[PDB]
Design a protein around this ligand. Sequence first.
Ligand code: KAI
Ligand code: KAI
Ligand code: NA
Ligand code: NA
Lengths: 245, 242
Amino acid sequence: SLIVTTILEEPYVLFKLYGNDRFEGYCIDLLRELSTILGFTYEIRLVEDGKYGAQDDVNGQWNGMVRELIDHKADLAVAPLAITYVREKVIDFSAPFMTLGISILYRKGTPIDSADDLAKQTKIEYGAVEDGATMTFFKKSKISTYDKMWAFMSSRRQSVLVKSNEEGIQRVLTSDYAFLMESTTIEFVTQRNCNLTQIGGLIDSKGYGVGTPMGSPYRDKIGIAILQLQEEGKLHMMKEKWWRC
Amino acid sequence: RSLIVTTILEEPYVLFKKLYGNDRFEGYCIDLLRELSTILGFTYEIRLVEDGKYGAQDQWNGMVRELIDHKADLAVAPLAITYVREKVIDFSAPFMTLGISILYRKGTPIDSADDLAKQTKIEYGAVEDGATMTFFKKSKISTYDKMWAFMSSRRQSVLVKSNEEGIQRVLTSDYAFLMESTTIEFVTQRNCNLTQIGGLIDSKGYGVGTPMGSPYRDKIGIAILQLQEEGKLHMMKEKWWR
Ligand SMILES: C=C(C)[C@H]1CN[C@H](C(=O)O)[C@H]1CC(=O)O
Ligand SMILES: C=C(C)[C@H]1CN[C@H](C(=O)O)[C@H]1CC(=O)O
Ligand code: NA
Ligand code: NA
């Protein structure tokens, strides 16, 4: 039986009881499909510290699901966990089951048109989920524009970084603020808020993948089952199902 | 030890420079190989796959077979990451994302794959035994199953040996070519009378291939992720797609 770590994020994982019946969502459907294909059984556990996976700056310790895998406290991570260089250095990822990018969530009708338009001003504050792949992207970026956006963010950190996608969306809906956010979530959000839009194109390019501890014999099997799910159009069906202004 | 890298000629991924050894070659994949070489600290010799194939099971052939038998350490090419290939070799994280789509002439009523499947006047096909054809052959999706029904009975007349043969087919007859969206994009920039019909029919990536169990898999994956996040892969694509 596999211990599966995960986290609540709509519509990937949400509360529907006891055990695995507690949950539903894209990632739950995916987990089910993989289970069927590979013939394993599993117990789902929500990550204890409510984190995704970042390395702390003072000490070199990892948190979240990543840490969970690193420590072998979980066999798999199934969540909208971005596949990043930093993370890929300490755990293994399956082939991606979803492709996305960082982008801008904002109100419609403004002249803000791209990351650059944001970066060269201070009237409109902007931000990201604290210690998520996105913020980490801006923090590690050596691209002038994004480096400057990180200077701005890090200097105004206390009031422009947030603890969740929902908090950020609320920030956009209750103040002059632009939320650097993952595009799939954006797409989900703008279906439900008619005055929210994606500003500009995709700032980068990444995938969501299943996480395994480094050197896990399940990374490959899982990657293969995911590839299969993609080829037979299952993942697209799960997308339509969970995403359907 | 210098690594042996298997690849294959395909514009603009790998082409003969207009020389000896690695100097003979240029392209997006050669640039990529150079970046990987710098990041991971290795030297290499580039070799074109003898049988000139990517990799299909009849026994495997092409670059996949080269990897399986340890005749090469890496495959760097526009090699689609697929279920069937992944069961026998290891792919790095993808350096490019794409999908099967349709290359056809402009100005027709054809707007989708289903538009092709439901008629017979316009013929259509794909590279034989490549990832695209294999996609259709194995598909349970009604439209794609029908297109495959069409194609398998006409294997000799609608299937081609290369993207190039397919493009000339599109240009010289009433024919639609099922092809990879990145190559379609490369092509529609040089023949303004050609176009993509519809959107992407599936989703896949190209990855660097390594023999199953190779310790280079992870390091290469990490380098590709690094290249992606600093914008280098995108710059390489802009460079070669214009
Ligand atoms: C839901 C948030 C906290 C997570 C989900 N994916 C990103 C991650 O893998 O860290 C984070 C969002 C982001 O940073 O844009
Ligand atoms: C150049 C062609 C023969 C290759 C390239 N990628 C696909 C592959 O990985 O097999 C093939 C094309 C295709 O199948 O549409
Ligand atoms: Na890893
Ligand atoms: Na594999």
